[PDB]
Each structure stands twice: as structure tokens, then as C-alpha cells.
Design a binder for this molecule. Sequence first.
Ligand SMILES: Nc1ncnc2c1c(I)cn2[C@@H]1O[C@H](CO)[C@@H](O)[C@H]1O
Ligand code: NA
Length: 352
Amino acid sequence: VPGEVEMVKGQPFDVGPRYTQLQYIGEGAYGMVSSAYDHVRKTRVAIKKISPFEHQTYCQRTLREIQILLRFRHENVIGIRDILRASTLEAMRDVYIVQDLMETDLYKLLKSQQLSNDHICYFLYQILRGLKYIHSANVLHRDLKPSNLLINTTCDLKICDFGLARIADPEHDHTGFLTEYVATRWYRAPEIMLNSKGYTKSIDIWSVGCILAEMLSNRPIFPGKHYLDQLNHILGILGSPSQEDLNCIINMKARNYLQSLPSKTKVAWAKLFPKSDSKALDLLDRMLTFNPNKRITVEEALAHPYLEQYYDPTDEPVAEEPFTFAMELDDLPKERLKELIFQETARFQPGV
Ligand SMILES: Nc1ncnc2c1c(I)cn2[C@@H]1O[C@H](CO)[C@@H](O)[C@H]1O
Ligand code: NA
């Protein structure tokens, strides 16, 4: 009963005999994710097809994702069940990451129903419980948003796609005005368009800040066409930055842009969100600060009263050891990255 190559969309998904009955799950600026029947574990799983190697940048992102996910182990973080790839370096064209199948994502859920303050609260907790574990290893997701937040029928939640993940390092965070980035625009912290590369845990807190407002209204906050517009959507709600708040902002252009913007007063949350728990609104406020230095940490957030029903310090594991990368890897020929990916996946080879 051979066959293999079922194709999701119009691309091959060579994962059989183990898995068959493939079904496209969705996007992935990264790779393509499908669901399939695992014949040994006799259960349906999710399997992402990554096809890098022809782009050094993709190679980097794929290697980081793999290396991190292979080393992480946490309930609110998606693990890797197996990794399929060619037994020959030369013949390896893509990598197949087999992961536990989740029913939906937070984005699909927000589009289908209005969450109760109870659901909103529980998902925030979980997101933060995973965030704590991730930050403990000094890792930054940098692309937290509704789609990267998988959820099952039992309301379980686990963080997604670490393709843009990197290690903190606030030493090389300054970058200059209007220096672009890859992460999803609607969730970019304001300092991203002003003077930051997003190399500090504060970048993750803002995103979660956006996600909370989102679960509270079933709509982005902050959309933005339109880079920069994004910067203006934020100021629209936060109001014009405080003096010393800048300021903190010595970047000629950044400081002048902000200066040329018509004064705008902050919009009370309880105003843009009438009928939402005050406890939740207070946390949000502390997550969406214009200044990254004043932004609430992942730990104080979990300790915030709105999560008091879930907060439990002896049941929110932390990373055993921090992580660090090259050291050269950023500037390295994509082929040498193919070897690292071929080595990192070695242990899953039914053979070598
Ligand atoms: N294990 C899983 N179960 C179900 N869906 C999954 C996963 C994984 I890994 C990713 N996705 C969905 O695919 C989208 C693109 O990354 C993500 O936004 C998400 O929609
Ligand atoms: Na994923």
C-alpha cells in the first residue's frame, strides 16, 4: 500500500508511510503546516514543512526555531515530536517538524466568538506562564500575536513559531529612526520605529499587551497600513509622549518626528473598552507603556491581581539554563547552516 506524496496546496509532503491523510492547516511566512495521521502513534498530528537552504536568512530562522524548540520543555510551549529529513546531506531539500496537533489558534477563535472575561483571563495567564519560561532562558519570541497562540478544545494554550526568536542583549538594541523589521506590524512596540531592534524582553510584553486588548475587543488595536502609520496608531491611543519619557530619545530624526506630531491626550482604557474588567484594564495599561523601561515584566504581570486566581509561583516552571548564539552565525554561508540543521536533526534519524 505504497504511495507517499499527497501534496497540500500544490507542494509535495513526503512524510509517508508514517503519516498520511495530509490536510493543510495554514500559513507560515516560515513554512507550511498541515495535519496528518501518525500511523505508529495512531493519532493525528501537525507537521510543518520548512524549505530553506536557498536563502541564508531562512536557514538562520529555521535553525534557531529548531534548536530552541528542541531544548524547550513547557506545557505552554509547543514541542517537537519528531523531525523528518533526507538521510543524505546532498538530497535534503526540506525539514518536516512533527508536532502535537492543536484544534485552533487565538486568531481563528477571536474571529468566531466573543471571549468571556474568564476565557480572556485564563489565556493571558497561560501566555504569560510560557513567556516566563521562555524569558528565563533569555529568549525573545519577538513575534507574539493571535495566530502564534495555539489552543485546543480544552482551552489549553501553547506559544507558536519562534522563527524570529533571538537572545536578549540590550547592548546592541539601539538602531536609529525608521529602521524596519520583519515581525508583524500591528504588534510592534513603538520603540521599533524609533530607536530599537527589539532585543529585550520589553518587546514581548508589548505584543502580549496588544493581544490582551485584542481578546478584549475582537479587533487589533493599532492596526496600521503602513509602517510608521503603525507608530501613529499607537500615539493615537497613548497620547503624546511625556517629556523625560522621550527622552531617552536622542535620535535626531526620531525626536524631531515625535516633536512635529500634533499634541494628543491619552485615551482612557475604560473608554476605549467600556464593560471590561478593571483589573484586566490595569494590567493592559502596564503592558502598553510608551517607554520600554517602564513596561511591566513578565513576572510582575503574573503577580498582577487580574491573574490572582491562577497565579501560583511553584507551578510556573522556568528555564534550567540561559541560551546564547553566534558569534558568527549571522554572517555565515547558508550551506554551513544546512549542516547545523542536518546535525541538529540527526538524533531523529531512524539511522544515522
Ligand atoms: N500544532 C499545530 N496545530 C494546529 N495549527 C498549527 C500548529 C502549528 I506548529 C501551526 N499551526 C497553525 O499554522 C499557522 C501557521 O504557522 C499558525 O498560525 C497556526 O494557525
Ligand atoms: Na508553529
